[PDB]
Amino acid sequence: ADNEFWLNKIRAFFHDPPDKSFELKTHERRASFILGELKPSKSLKRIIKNADIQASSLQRVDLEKSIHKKELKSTFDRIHNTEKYEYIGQPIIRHPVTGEIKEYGTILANLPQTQREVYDVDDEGKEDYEEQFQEILSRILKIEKKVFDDFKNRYSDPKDLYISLWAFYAEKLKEALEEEFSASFAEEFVNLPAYTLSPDHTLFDHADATSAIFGAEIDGKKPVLVLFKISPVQKFIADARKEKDLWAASHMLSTLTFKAISFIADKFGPDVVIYPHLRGNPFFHAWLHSKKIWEFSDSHSLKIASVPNKFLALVGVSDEKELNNLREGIRNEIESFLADLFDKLWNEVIVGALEHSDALKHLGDKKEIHKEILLKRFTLTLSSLKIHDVDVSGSKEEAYEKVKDFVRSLGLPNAIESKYLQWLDMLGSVEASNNRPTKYDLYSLYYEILTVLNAIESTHFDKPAEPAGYKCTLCGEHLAIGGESREMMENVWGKIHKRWPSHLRSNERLCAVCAVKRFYPKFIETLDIFEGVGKVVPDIESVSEVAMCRRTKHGITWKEVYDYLRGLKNVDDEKLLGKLENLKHSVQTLINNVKSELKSRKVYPEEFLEGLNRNFSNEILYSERLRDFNTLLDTLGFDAAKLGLDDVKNYETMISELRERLSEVYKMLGEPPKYYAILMMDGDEMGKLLSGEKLKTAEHYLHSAILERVSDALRVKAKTVRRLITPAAHSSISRALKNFSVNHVPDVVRKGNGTLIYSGGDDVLVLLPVDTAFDVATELAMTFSTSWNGWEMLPGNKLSAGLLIVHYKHPLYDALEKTRELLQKAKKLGRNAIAVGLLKRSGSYYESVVNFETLEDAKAVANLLVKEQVSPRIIYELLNFADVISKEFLHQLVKYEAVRHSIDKNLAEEFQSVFARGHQGVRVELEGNDEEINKYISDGANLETFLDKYEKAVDVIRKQVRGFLNLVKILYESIR
């Protein structure tokens, strides 16, 4: 039954031994030996192998049948007598996207130093090498057997053992090997490819793809590709007041989509979902801990919403009714989680605040409508594309002709139709009778059509008819809770604010969605995958806190001293310890007076007022906020008029003393920063990359030294035909995306003192101080552009970014919308460019869309500016001349201005050089629909020569220089 299905999935996972590339001759028996008593049957092995060949690496499984006077081989045993094989060379690995070729260093060091490149069957001087190879292979097999035996012994249920193996078998085996051989040995060994003749993906990625395909086709189930989108996202994210609402919205969205993902995974299997790569995901680890499979290791922080709002899975459905049942199950799971949260809120913050009032009875009949309003808020769209079973019976030529004719019957436009016809021809250009097309040959086409369908089918909405009444004050679109009558709503919400003053305010009247999001942080410790992970909610409350994260001139951040004020983290430095202690005593005495006064009014819970020593608003460190008692009370979140304390004036001595102490601290800690940076990034044309257009020709993804030895026809085909991704290649791409988005961005964000909020796949959303915003942006862009960091894959693609520097007092929704507009502008203007914008508290707006390398030189000139090496007046003159300047006297005018406004000749020359180099990369927005110029700027090429050929180069250069000065002005304001 289901246990048999799980055992079959386990067998399909291990049909290829992890050390298959070491010796291809006896790989099947090694796999059967590593599977132990769970070894596959005969026909089940045959169907598993059929699923494997019909799965991805079809650019290898239709290429490993190279019959050029022999069967081409590429292994490590190199005893493959040339009478029938004629091998090529040592195994390599190629990046699935950029085709970057990496050899295997440490694996060869442990291999015997053979005196010849090739060995025959029974030649002399071979016995010792064969004995050494047998010894090392036996050691590897013993290690694998020990690991798998431990895994089998620990877990009794087939499903638990299957999921545990899929999640940690690679990690445990790598740990054992690095304990035995070496760390680099295990790192290289665990990254061996499956099909060595085209090492474009890892062995384990191929194993996961094989398991997914086999599960999709098992028991007569027709494989189907399913894509799910929960929308809208940006509008739901933007509806925030403090940073906590934004974090709660992001985490809630990620939790909902991961609830759907977990339902799918527990139904079919963890590997059935291609994107996101669940392995290594902190949410997946928490889910595993929930299922009592593996205890959470606390290595990866759960406070980050590390799950995208869409997932793509490969599942097998018996019929359409099964797919409809799956969709209804996903929707009901998500709605059940939402209703659980709504009930928790309604019975812990509403009933607990109106335990006896008649207002509870008035809104008691409105529980159903608000529950249904919250449930029907999001749109859950599930789109499924049945994978066609192409008739491959008959001759190889006839089968390929039938497949191509089926492709031609779809009526697709000539561009991608020609692309897929070329792919099919290149597949059919191999010389082998047994070569046959597979159903998953057009997996890329199915994915593209599925994405189009999802983008179309997700535009349908069905939402209820809410009654009249005043709307929520935060979202603004939904009727507020108990908002039927203004007096009733005000009474209810005042009672709730009195009951919960740490979260709400004196004038907040939320709806179901907004209230659930606001109270989301206090509930999640009692939700499914939690209560056993620990510290999910982050210790950051307001957007001003991340602004204070900027480090001062004494190697100490305002946030750190604020945390010292509450006593959380003591300050090690003693040169300012006395002043800090004085300020802490002053603020503690003032808040003690405030809480003692508030306790007299008997309007707030004693428990909440007791903790005001620790959870007082950090905005009191701003000297502006301490102009009187009413503003001080409002800063802490209390309405003086509502409490009637607008006339109290006996605390003026305390406020004045605190202001004096704050000025004393400012004397050498500097004024507390009031500006922070919002940075949201996206993947550049990821749909095009997955569509195959941005992928390179098949020559790179194949073994480097096998193109020549192969037949000429398919040689030229692979020379000029672009590869199309497939389940294992897609899984490897998603694995690289997971590696980046999980192991890299959090680390550089923490090192950059910023607070990462959402890092799901390609996208990233962080809030950082104005100090390290640009540095971390460039670091993350270079990390994403990387292809092979150490021994782990990386996306090897580009990001457009939108960075906004805005005042902490600015409303969160408008700042987020402006940052999204910046990102959209960056994408609109030759992607792989960062769009930097500054929004001052007054309301003035700056703009600049430049390349990612333009920041460094702009940072250099800004550093020269702040260090008083060059007068700031040079900026004003250059802006004045930017309107009337041309490329011919660019350098001369810049040199004159530099030598005039610098300190010496060397500084002027350096300024000229950095200005000349940096200003080349700046995106421009001409009146005409011109993207070619931005494309030329985006790389660094003959664009300068092309500018001479270009007919409006003067406008381009003028916009370039004006934008460079604008961005350097932004940088100078940020540092200063």
């Binding site: 809208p232 909405f461 069905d462 809410e466 009654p467 004038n507 409303p811």
Partner: protein, 322 residues
């Protein structure tokens, strides 16, 4: 009768997010039909669901020739290429096709009534489209006004000197021709004028029979949303009720394909009860419905009203062929 409404100054139409003291930044949205309907109601009340019906509202530009601009359809790619949904019987699914790739970006802008008389056939010229910047711009006023924190940002609609807003009203219900009335959020006003029905309407009205018979003979019909509609029956849903097309005489529908943007969320102030009106969701204007109808259409007008609140100006839809 058209109702030209030239704004003397910029206009701001309040988005549903509140803005009194806290959300100082107040953005703007395109004028909803309810706001202009209320303005016209005030105008007729001063001159002498309202008893009179407002067909809808469109932008216009007056540069020598007076032309009404209709919101850019969601059926037009950014390369001025139409998108047609063709179904794949092999895979059992229907996708939207632009004959240049399965992916496309809708063209934001406008479409003149000459465009409408040609776009309904299935082709679009180059001069038939106008970009957004040629009509209005997003002018954001800043720092308008114990008032250290009252400084609030506001974004308005800065119409071009030759561009305004025209409101379509059915024949009859005559009232004052020239005058001034207040429209929008922060107190502003327009210099409205009453003008005879433009020749573009009669151009499209006279040529209605040709497109109607083409639709009837080809068995295919496309419905273009000039103004947003509330198509829900009990609640608010984007799914097109088959009975709704039964009014025009559709015996049966084979398949319905619709492409549209995010829904518009809006409400109003009930002056009678001094309480905000119930929140509503409407399909955004510019969306198009592709249907495969069985039978024939007997509508004598090239337009029909779909959904609720059609008297205000909601649900202005055009019958076209694909």
């Amino acid at each position: 009768m058209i109702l030209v409404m030239k704004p003397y100054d910029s206009l701001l139409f309040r988005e549903p997010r509140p803005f009194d003291v806290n959300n100082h930044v107040a953005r703007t949205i395109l004028p909803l039909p309810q706001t202009l309907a209320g303005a016209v109601r005030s105008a007729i009340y001063v001159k002498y669901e309202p008893e009179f019906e407002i067909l809808g509202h469109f932008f216009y530009r007056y540069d020598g020739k007076f032309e009404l601009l209709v919101e850019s359809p969601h059926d037009v790619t950014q390369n001025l290429g139409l998108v047609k949904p063709h179904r794949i019987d092999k895979l059992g699914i229907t996708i939207l096709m632009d004959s240049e790739g399965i992916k496309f970006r809708p063209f934001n802008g406008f479409l003149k009534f000459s465009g409408l008389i040609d776009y309904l056939q299935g082709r679009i010229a180059e001069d038939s489209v106008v970009e957004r910047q040629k009509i209005f711009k997003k002018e954001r006023r800043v720092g308008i006004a114990t008032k250290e924190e009252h400084f609030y940002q506001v974004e308005m609609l800065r119409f071009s000197d030759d561009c305004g807003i025209a409101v379509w009203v059915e024949d009859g219900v005559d009232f004052d021709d020239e005058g001034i009335l207040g429209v929008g959020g922060e107190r502003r006003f327009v210099k409205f004028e009453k003008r005879e029905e433009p020749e573009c309407i009669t151009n499209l009205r006279s040529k209605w029979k040709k497109i109607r018979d083409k639709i009837n003979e080809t068995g295919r019909l496309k419905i273009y949303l000039a103004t947003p509609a509330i198509l829900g029956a009990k609640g608010y849903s984007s799914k097109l009720d088959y009975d709704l097309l039964g009014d025009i005489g559709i015996e049966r529908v084979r398949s319905v394909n619709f492409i549209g943007g995010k829904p518009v969320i809006f409400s109003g102030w009930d002056f009678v009860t001094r309480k905000p009106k119930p929140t509503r969701y409407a399909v955004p204007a510019g969306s198009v419905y592709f249907v495969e109808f069985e039978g024939e259409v007997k509508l004598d007008m090239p337009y029909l009203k779909l959904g609720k609140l059609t008297k205000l100006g909601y649900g202005l839809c055009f019958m076209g062929v694909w």
